[PDB]
Symmetry: none
Subunit: 106 residues, 4 copies
């Protein structure tokens, strides 16, 4: 009955060296953060936004983990997943971009 789209194109510099996350015994992730900048025209006034990148999928997890280093420019595509975790009845965010593709610019 219906298709939706949740797509994110991000191109920026990696802020830190990636961490292989294997807490307790769940399905593993490669976590890194990407820096995106933004100058405002309303004038050269800027801002820098930090994206928590998560790499699920057996293909890209390992390749992201060994080759992505701090300072690398990366292009990627993924989907916005808000990390909706409960606390005391209600909920709050732990948002990630979950990667489907990275092109390394080198």
């Amino acid at each position: 009955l219906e298709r939706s789209l949740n797509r994110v194109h991000l191109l920026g510099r990696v802020g830190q060296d990636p961490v292989l996350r294997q807490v307790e015994g769940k399905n593993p992730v490669t976590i890194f953060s990407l820096a995106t900048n933004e100058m405002w025209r309303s004038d050269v006034s800027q801002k820098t936004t930090w994206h928590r990148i998560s790499v699920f999928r057996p293909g890209l997890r390992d390749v992201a983990y060994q080759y992505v280093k701090k300072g690398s420019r990366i292009y990627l595509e993924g989907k916005i997943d808000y990390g909706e975790y409960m606390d005391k009845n209600n909920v709050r965010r732990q948002a990630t971009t979950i990667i489907a593709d990275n092109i390394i610019f080198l």
Copy 2:
């Protein structure tokens, strides 16, 4: 200086009828939610949208109604704030483009 990309493309159903909010003293924003959802072989994602753009916010107030199918493009903002010495997120996609599927 170093060029970046921060683009989200969304297409889904509007979940709520838009609310006119105002950041700080004066800064007009229209806010709604949009559902997108994806299916596995054994999840609805709700996104808050902020249309701060001088004219796009007016149009989206006038014409975005709950359950509408919309296409939009924007940039992600994690909206980090301290509720009480504790970092939190108020993540929003600030919409720049917006193609409305109705008449």
Copy 3:
């Protein structure tokens, strides 16, 4: 050694009812055209561009062929293929967007 990208996101109204192209005995295509508009800010002055859409792939060819009608709003993704055909030694264009995906907005 290297990845490139040739991607096109087009959202617009279909100009004519699609034609199943099977000239002589080649691999079949579903051809339709999409209308994209463009207002210029430099002021409400407009322009309308016509895209020759081509649908290869056994999945989408038939589905594009039966369901896409004149006047339908369609969203699609494809790649720019210039129809480089020779004449008398040199070459000229017959450009198509070759579709990989259509979302019908209904």
Copy 4:
């Protein structure tokens, strides 16, 4: 009025060192070609880019050099003209965004 999308995203190697051209009497454009290519299991596509934008064209003249890897976004223009009572195409992607991969 009816909103549309006409967006191309390209990433490839620049094939030629940019030429400063001028449409009609006065309208500055920088033009280069970009190769993208895709591989089948048994093709280079050459695109002409026009940067007409007041400042982006200057930057791209200064800094686009042959063989550079570039990322760009633009809108397709089929450039239809009559050479002699016969319709022809001069297809170009008019670039709006342009993220340069060098220093």
